[PDB]
């Protein structure tokens, strides 16, 4: 039984579906209403964060890890996607789930000059557990495009060229308000 508040997110998925080709071809559009679990994580300053703190904006939620090469390969594109579309209506929420050497992922972003993504993390990797339980963490990386209501619009298991024009078009269409 799909949460009725997420039926509007279902509607968006059907509109932008023709934009799910090329670089963003591996996106599986939501066909049923799905409210995401309120992922609990931290920001760069150690303050507790939840997915519901980002209510009101369309989000791209990514889970990445240092041991997952393609997850760390796509961090520039996500960073380029941020700042290009971030604003009152959109954010990329990239969450690191390294459980060991917490300094390693932090160093990755600094040494690669990726400063637009902040540093959200869950060293418990429970955010991974959260997506796995609802069939939205089939691999790493995993990324979910989430609406202002915390409802699923789409999901992709694996990396993508997020800074490409194919990627940009679907997000721009998905975005509102």
Partner 1 sequence: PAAIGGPFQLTDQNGKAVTDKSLKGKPTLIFFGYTHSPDVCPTSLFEISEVLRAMGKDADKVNAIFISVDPERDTPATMKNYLSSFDPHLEGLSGDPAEIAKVITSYRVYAKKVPTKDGDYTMDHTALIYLMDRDGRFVSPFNLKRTPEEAAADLKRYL
Residues lying near partner 1 in the complex (CB under 8 A):
65-71, 98-100, 125, 128-129, 132, 137, 139-141, 157-159
- Identity of the residue, 148 or 159, whose beta carbon is nearer to partner 1 in the bound complex: 159
Q: Tokens at residue 76, please? A: 């520039």
- To partner 1, the closest distance from the beta carbon of 138 in angstroms equals 8
- To partner 1, the closest distance from the beta carbon of 134 in angstroms equals 11
Phi and psi, residue 150, nearest 5°? 85, 20
Element housing 41 (H / E): strand 40-42
- Identity of the residue, 98 or 152, whose beta carbon is nearer to partner 1 in the bound complex: 98
Q: Buried (b) or exposed (e) across 93-117, using 16+ Cβ within 10 A? A: bbbbbbeeeeeebeebbeeeebebb
- To partner 1, the closest distance from the beta carbon of 87 in angstroms equals 30
- Identity of the residue, 84 or 132, whose beta carbon is nearer to partner 1 in the bound complex: 132
- To partner 1, the closest distance from the beta carbon of 67 in angstroms equals 4
Cβ-count burial of 161 within 10 angstroms (0-12 exposed, 13-18 middle, 19+ buried)? middle
What whole-number distance in Å separates Cα of residue 55 and Cα of residue 137?
22
- Identity of the residue, 63 or 93, whose beta carbon is nearer to partner 1 in the bound complex: 63
- Identity of the residue, 36 or 65, whose beta carbon is nearer to partner 1 in the bound complex: 65
- To partner 1, the closest distance from the beta carbon of 25 in angstroms equals 13
Residue from 2, 146, 7, 3 nearest 63 by CA = 146
């Amino acid at each position: 039984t799909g949460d009725p508040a997420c039926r509007a997110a279902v509607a968006t998925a059907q509109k932008i579906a023709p934009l799910a080709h090329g670089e963003v071809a591996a996106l599986t559009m939501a066909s049923a209403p799905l409210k995401l679990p309120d992922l609990a994580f931290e920001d760069a300053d150690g303050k507790p964060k939840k997915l519901s703190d980002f209510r009101g904006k369309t989000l791209l939620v990514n889970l990445w890890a240092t041991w997952c090469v393609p997850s760390r390969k796509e961090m520039p594109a996500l960073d380029e996607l941020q700042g290009k579309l971030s604003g009152p209506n959109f954010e990329v929420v990239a969450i690191n789930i390294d459980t060991r050497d917490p300094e390693k992922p932090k160093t990755f972003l600094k040494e690669a000059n990726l400063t637009r993504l902040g540093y959200f993390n869950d060293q418990k990797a429970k955010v991974f557990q959260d997506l796995k339980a609802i069939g939205r963490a089939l691999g790493m990386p995993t990324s979910v495009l989430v609406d202002p209501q915390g409802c699923e619009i789409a999901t992709i298991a694996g990396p993508a060229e997020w800074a490409s024009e194919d990627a940009l078009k679907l997000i721009r269409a998905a975005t509102g308000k």
